[model samples]
Target: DDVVDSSKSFVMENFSSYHGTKPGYVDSIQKGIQKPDDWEGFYSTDNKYDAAGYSVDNENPLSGKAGGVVKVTYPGLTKVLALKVDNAETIKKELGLSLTEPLMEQVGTEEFIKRFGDGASRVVLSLPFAEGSSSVKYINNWEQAKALSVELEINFETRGKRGQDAMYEYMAQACACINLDWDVIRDKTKTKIESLKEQGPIKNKMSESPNKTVSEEKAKQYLEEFHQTALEQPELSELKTVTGTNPVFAGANYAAWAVNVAQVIDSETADNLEKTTAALSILPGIGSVMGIADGAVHHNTEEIVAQSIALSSLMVAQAIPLVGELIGFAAYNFVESIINLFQVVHNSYNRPAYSPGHKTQPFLHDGYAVSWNTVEDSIIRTGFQGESGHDIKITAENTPLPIAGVLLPTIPGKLDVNKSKTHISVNGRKIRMRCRAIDGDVTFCRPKSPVYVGNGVHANLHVAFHRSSSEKIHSNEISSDSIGVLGYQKTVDHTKVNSKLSLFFEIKSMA
Candidate 1:
């Protein structure tokens, strides 16, 4: 169903009166919005019209008017799109291009490791979680950003609308496209290289060194060899929690410029020297746009080698002989590969520029944390990022037990703080996901519990922690329990309070 029921007017139902205009909502730096501290807050505006980023110019490169607003409700999970009229075939075409079919099926996949080893192969794949190692966080956030992109497209196409979370229901399927895009980039480059490689070689003679040329039929085989490395991404990184831009299309620009530089010698050297000298000539015009000047190419000579395999192919193909058009095409592709591998390419709001979506809270935090240190004594450190503290001390007069319990662990509270625990999920819920007192696998103190220890003075309760076990437990308990938002929870009665403290820390929700 090409944009199922594609229509002229949309629901604009949840479009916030102050969505992008608010404090927590932010814009990408590429948009030229200024940043305070590290965040690029919303662009200044009282109009709500432009600030909410309601203007759909990016949506329809073809000019059109936004029809204006409206309203929703059917179920907590339901929504209705309402809208006013305006110029919209630009609207029609874009919508049609969105979700052409119905919801996606498995788009199934299968995989495994080829090597032997330590315990490495045990856990093949796991969804990225929020508070784990940088490696895990990077993986999760990158996909979450893209997941929201497709979700935004389908929701808009379905309802012709703009309200918030009206699209949450579709999020799961959208998220499933993990690396679904990985193949598209590889395919596009392959198309261009194959085109030029099949052409008759261009042999030019200028005194000294004549340019080099390759066999027409043999070049096709070499094309396959070079492109295979696309799977062997010797390059790439997690720029941030999210990203929106495509690879530096500047590769188009860089190689385009390189062609002209090489063009200077295209008639001179037949050897591949033109491609090398063109890149080395280092045109300031290439600036950081080529991704080379930005330092993305400094590391990993492997992809650098790839750059030549491609540029070299382009050179010999039909061979203007990889001169003008061919060289630019190959160079553009090379730069894209490089930038995707390097660059922190993220903007504000955890989304990329031109990638419009909700400014929801982070999702992975609801998953488990590797160590309790992240639950580390602070509000933000515990994953309650950007939250105002509802914090307050608890005490009970009628019962010293509860209040006394909060005050427990005066000493060994000092001791167990060292048992950095790994909070993995059990069959259903989260357990201390405990380990013995710690390791490279890691652990940290579990929240302390209180034990009544009456001395000669006032009622005294000793604060207790997962002190130690013959089992060498760092954290966790019997079997496993289903882990919900509060993946970490333990208690000793109203007297024991880790349970009470944990309930407050679960906000790293699926905003």
Candidate 2:
């Protein structure tokens, strides 16, 4: 039998530690089950705990103790989570790395918010969707674009608006981080300045002037303190959304360039004039990109933000067509427009060009063979070479390519092959088929063949389209559904019908 252990232990609620101590269980048993304090194992001198073995004091990085965090005895569970942040200065100091905001995520995110809240909700968290702001179209379109957006709803699942929704979510998160960073930077800077004052007595040549030079540590502390203010400003978060979305990355990026525009007039007047100008030259390109976008793009900053918002709604709208098509209803043009919207990515980063895919189209990267040659009226053909041949009738005119129609030859009953030549007999005329004959992409037109000429020589023509070569062909009578082909009466002149005729043969379908 398993040991059903039940023994309770009690101690005078407190114990002493190196820092004068607090009571914690070596291990505790209440009634029968052994219960250990949550923070007991991580008990170090740095963590001060009460008799119940939980920290009596800890600050919530964002809203302090009032921010849903409370000090209490360990009657319940407490999980210790320490927050940490590493940013630009941290990168410059600890790692040889540099990164910028206005990154794609930021741009995509801001555009997300602009569609949702008119730029108002980007900064302020806990706001509702504006009264008349419902995006039924956005949802419809986005689904068609990223066919799998709905299969999983892990994040932004319920959010109705893409542009505004994603931006506000990011903004709220960034604000929380900013608030935490504000506190840490302030606290660390305070600690640094106190240390700097402590070193006040060091007799230094730098203090010769009444205006003493700040220590390297104090200087760093001041910079960090300034950064806290900069981070809190709405402009920091707002400007990130406005300038360039993909946050000019590397060698000369827009965001870094913007840093140079930080009022050179002020920096030039600062204590370190060299450092001032060194940071001042980054603005021109930043301002240029922003300026070009501001002037060139049709929409306002907020509307530019709203452009992609329609993607989701349009996607959802297009899904209706997909589902509709399955049920025999199709709005073909609308579906195509939605697809185009989904692919337009604003030329953000000079990405490799995008090529649209058909439900049958082959990719450029897919392996295939290619060759080219000129063909004449006699139809010089090449396709999968000997396996296929195309009989094309090249006309004189630089004419419009006809989608469907017919070519009617005059007075052709049963035309002979060798002795009695042949002429075509189609109902209307101008029958041009834009089609691929696979295993052979064939285009045949034989005015002299008995195979095509019938008694009265009537051969009904049907044209078909499909999602792919593998898809079942959807055939419709081409003459009934298309414009007739015309004007090429002389493309194929025959030897004229003779009195003698050969045995008639009908053309059999390969498909």
Candidate 3:
């Protein structure tokens, strides 16, 4: 309640601040796909969920509390700390309450997360909704309600690489950055060994002179080979510490994790993620200052979180628009206020971008564990062949197509097949492309109105994902069912082609 009192001032401030222009590049949005079945018109929203106040519903779980943002918006917070606590209704229904009770009146987030955030973790690095929208008006609302609560204590079976796997993956990604000579890496390895030989008793462990003067790829091979030998000694490896926790990203493992985080975003708004990259990249400086060197620095979730929090302050100090924090560990005290904060804003959550495709899909029930993109893409590809009958393609690949998420749209539509080109984007989320078309349009077989392979083809479509109880279409809207242009190399009417030609969209979890 005190947190609520402390944060209410900011909610008023949050409402005033972020409501202006787009947060970053595009506009703010509500994909709307993930809302709860019981949700209905904010349940008579008096506070609009943005205004500050406490809840009074005794029968409901969040009996009396300040709104979402009030509890989570830290006292010193300068940059908007937006969160989209996905799967809130699931948590709500599990607990029993009107959806609005969890998201409304500036008080919902505190009670909601306090009740539901048992196993969940709050991500400090990425804003589930803010970056994609880039709206100052967007924050302070407990609005989005999303996740990607990835990062296990150890291992990739769930999400993210851990332990030795982290080392190899780190080595591989580090080596992937080209232009360096293999011999330098080889000699680099040798230099360590030589230093070890001189300090012989001083250094932990070192291998003999390495491989041929190969390229970066070959360097990955040799480094992994060398590390595997050294790591087996375990005592020789960099396990490091995280205060009260177990060892985390060790000896450049976080460095490797940094590369992969860049990879998850590589397809979409990785451009903006460069902001986060810029933010996180500063850690090495801190690490170096602490007397760490190459392959020497190590950390755990707490360390990463600490460094990220420290750096997060700098980003705010810099007045930078984009900010980031790769929070490690799950469910800290602050997380309780933050996790369920945006329960009903948008219906999805963010999980690690590490899992392969099929893992994202629900297990038999599509209701709410995960909506794996890999599975969706693979299954969707089978239909690509059939779509070819409607829309021919040079490559019938339904690659990751963003329906124009937070970034810009992906494929281009033009009169000539050649005129239609390809690109990458999705309002800054994951978006894959399927097939190109000169005219014919593709869509969900049922539940949606169909448009032809011809231009000027129009239909009232759904843009937001159907929250079971709800679902609309901007075409450019983010989620719902799938959509696309049907045919390739078909002729277009000059008049139809010119008919405002804007039918694009993207969903946060897709692709």
How do all models score by TM-score?
0.21, 0.15, 0.20
lDDT (10s digit) by residue, model 2, range 190-234: 343333223432123113322323343433343333333332333
- How far out, in Å, is residue 186 in model 3? 28
lDDT of 3 by residue, 297-378 (tens): 2321222323322221211211111112222211121212111221211111121122211323222111111122332232
Model 2 misplaced regions, further than 4 Å: 1-248, 254-256, 263-511
Candidates by lDDT, descending order: 1, 3, 2
Identify the candidate with maximal TM-score.
1
Worst 10-residue lDDT window for candidate 1 reads 103-112
Candidate 1 Cα errors over 4 Å, as ranges: 1-221, 224-328, 331-413, 417-511
Best-matching candidate per lDDT = 1
Clashes of each: 35, 43, 69
Q: Model 1 misses residue 498 by how many Å?
A: 29
Number of clashes in model 2?
43
State each model's CA lDDT, in order: 0.25, 0.23, 0.25
What does the lDDT read for residue 123 in candidate 2? Answer: 12
Q: Write the per-residue lDDT of candidate 1 for residues 334-424, one digit (tens) a residue.
A: 3332323222121111222211111211112222211112232212112122212221212222322221112112112212322233232
Candidate closer to the true structure by TM-score (higher is better), 1 or 3: 1
